[PDB]
């Protein structure tokens, strides 16, 4: 379970992704400084339920739905995958 | 691969299969099925023939326009053998005769001619050679033609060491000389059999299975240099096989034993026909040699063919041997033959 890459998907306008949008404005720059070699791929796209994909060793991918979450819940949800398990 | 022989299409009549075959002996029983299986997938098929052109006519519809090439040849004339194989990537030899003629004996047909064909194919740079022999081919066989086939197998591999050798048992089908042969014993009222057919075991194979395996061997990567035994699913004693044949024709079956030495003498008499002999001494010998038990050699399954039971196909061969009273009798009315495991 070595983390290899994180992908964040979100809409640009939907209210369901407002928390994920806030998380990026607040925490992303701090997060990227902490993990300078971890790919954190942010990919916006209209009318998408926000999601978090974590790719581990040997192509194992786990998905977390960030829909209708707050900026802290998204921080909480995201710290689980980076820190380890839960 | 030359771009002209890259396979294209979906495997139909207008497709290109990549196979460029010269099929010797394509004008006989096994050959018509082999040409048909090649021609239906879009192969170029060169067909050497020495018969009248009337006799090849049934082959002309077996391929798309331009995919069948008919050439004259003479088994003696070595230039016509080279002419027929100089453009092909596989050569298939089906030359055979069940009797000897004034001009060609069993050595000619099963040794000299196959060697000449294989010789020319090696020097032309033919990629694959497929040679049809016989399951019971053996140097110590009672049958002269089966001894000839054993020598021919060894002479062919001496000039074409990668040759694929196909060893079928007796081949049944609409134009066979096996089921039709026994069915035609009705004309003599009683059926002689040496030891009443209780000392002979047969494992006959369906003609379309052999041709399918032969055509699969033109493309099978794992087939080169090998000897295959093409047999049917089931073994029978010659008694029960003949009884089943007469059951399927709904003709009165009256068997009686006949010593082999008397039987061979009758074969010599029928062998004197200057046309196509109804039987010969060699034919009598081969009917009463048992098929060798399966061991070691790969079979039809190794070439992607499931052997068809005789019980599934016999009626398509034997319905024309019935009288009007029994013509419409179905498959299930005939009791199937009893099988053996030895």
């Amino acid at each position: 379970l070595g983390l290899r890459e994180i992908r964040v998907h979100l809409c640009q306008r939907s209210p369901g992704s407002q928390g994920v949008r806030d998380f990026i404005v607040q925490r992303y720059v701090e997060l990227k400084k902490a993990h300078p070699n971890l790919p954190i791929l942010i990919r916006e796209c209209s009318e998408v339920q926000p999601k978090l994909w974590a790719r581990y060793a040997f192509g194992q991918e786990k998905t977390v739905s960030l829909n209708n979450l707050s900026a802290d819940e998204v921080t909480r949800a995201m710290q689980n995958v980076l820190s380890g398990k839960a | 691969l030359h771009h002209a022989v890259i396979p294209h299409g979906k495997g139909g009549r207008s497709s290109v299969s990549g196979v460029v075959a010269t099929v010797f002996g394509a004008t006989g029983f096994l050959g018509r099925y082999v040409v048909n299986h090649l021609g239906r997938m879009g192969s170029q098929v060169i067909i050497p023939y020495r018969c009248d052109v009337y006799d090849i006519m049934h082959l002309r519809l077996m391929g798309d326009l331009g995919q069948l090439t008919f050439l004259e040849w003479d088994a003696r004339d070595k230039d016509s053998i080279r002419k027929a194989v100089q453009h092909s990537n596989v050569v298939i030899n089906l030359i055979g005769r069940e009797w000897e003629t004034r001009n060609f004996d069993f050595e000619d047909v099963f040794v000299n001619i196959p060697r000449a064909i294989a010789q020319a194919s090696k020097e032309a740079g033919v990629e694959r050679f497929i040679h049809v022999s016989h399951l019971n081919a053996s140097m110590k066989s009672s049958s002269k033609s089966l001894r000839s086939k054993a020598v021919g197998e060894k002479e062919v591999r001496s000039v074409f060491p990668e040759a694929i050798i196909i060893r079928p048992s007796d081949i049944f089908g609409r134009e066979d000389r096996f089921l039709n042969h026994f069915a035609n014993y009705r004309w003599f009222l009683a059926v002689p059999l040496v030891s009443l057919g209780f000392k002979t075991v047969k494992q006959p194979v369906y003609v379309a299975d052999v041709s399918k395996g032969i055509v699969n061997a033109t493309k099978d990567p794992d087939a080169v240099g090998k000897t295959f035994a093409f047999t049917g699913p089931n073994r029978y004693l010659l008694f029960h096989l003949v009884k089943y044949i007469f059951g399927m024709t709904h003709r009165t079956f009256i068997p009686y034993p006949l010593p082999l030495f008397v039987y061979s003498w009758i074969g010599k008499l029928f062998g004197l026909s200057p046309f196509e002999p109804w039987t010969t001494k060699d034919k009598v010998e081969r009917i009463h040699i048992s098929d060798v038990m399966p061991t070691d050699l790969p079979g039809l399954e190794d070439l992607g063919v499931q052997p068809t039971p005789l019980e599934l196909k016999s009626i398509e061969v034997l319905r024309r041997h019935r009288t009007y009273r029994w013509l419409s009798s179905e498959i299930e009315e005939t009791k199937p033959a009893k099988t053996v495991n030895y």
Binding site: - | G12, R13, S14, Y33, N36, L61, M62
Partner: protein, 208 residues
């Protein structure tokens, strides 16, 4: 008087227009549209329920007497929700006139058979069923008529391909004619012929 142009009279147009009003006033329950072309041919467009009443009226009424069914056919227009247009072409010997009656159908809505009105329709309705797949209620004997036995599909549909899906050949292994997927040594070459410039402004469709 203009030698290359086809001469025209207004008399037939007026006569056919008046009879079109007559038919519409008598059969308002079914008549959806009446028009007379500049080729002076009257078309009555009806709801499919009106086929038997409409064609019975035209055969038997004393001022109509369209006693001869010239032909009965279909047109496939895939862009319509009822893609099949059913066309009856009728002849009146008494008045030396012709009329066209049109209704519509889709793949799952049969039309009534008019064999009780014109026995002539028997094979035509079989042809429409065979070629287009439109079913006819109360037909005495409805089954394929032009296609081969066991033929699958309705080849005059616009989306049935020109060369079909299966072809035939004799196979020597089984000793009979067999059906196999179509494979063509030369594909039919499709030509794009339409000019990108408009030909007939009288038929220009609104810009929308």
């Amino acid at each position: 008087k203009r030698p290359t142009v086809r001469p025209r009279s207004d008399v037939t147009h007026k006569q056919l227009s008046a009879f079109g009003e007559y038919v519409a006033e008598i059969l308002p329950k079914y008549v959806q549209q009446v028009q007379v072309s500049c080729l002076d041919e009257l078309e009555i467009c009806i709801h499919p329920d009106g086929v038997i009443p409409t064609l019975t009226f035209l055969r038997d009424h004393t001022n109509a007497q369209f006693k001869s069914l010239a032909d009965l056919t279909a047109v496939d227009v895939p862009t319509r929700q009822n893609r099949f247009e059913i066309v009856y072409n009728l002849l009146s010997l008494r008045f030396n006139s012709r009329i066209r009656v049109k209704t519509y159908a889709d793949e799952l809505t049969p039309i009534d058979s008019i064999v009780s009105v014109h026995i002539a329709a028997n094979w035509y309705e079989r042809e429409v069923w065979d070629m287009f797949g439109v079913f006819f209620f109360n037909h005495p004997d409805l089954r394929r008529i032009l296609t081969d036995y066991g033929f699958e599909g309705h080849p005059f549909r616009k989306d049935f391909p020109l060369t079909g899906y299966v072809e035939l050949r004799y196979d020597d292994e089984v000793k009979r004619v067999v059906a196999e997927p179509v494979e063509l040594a030369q594909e039919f070459r499709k030509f794009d012929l339409n000019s990108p410039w408009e030909a007939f402004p009288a038929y220009r469709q609104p810009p929308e």
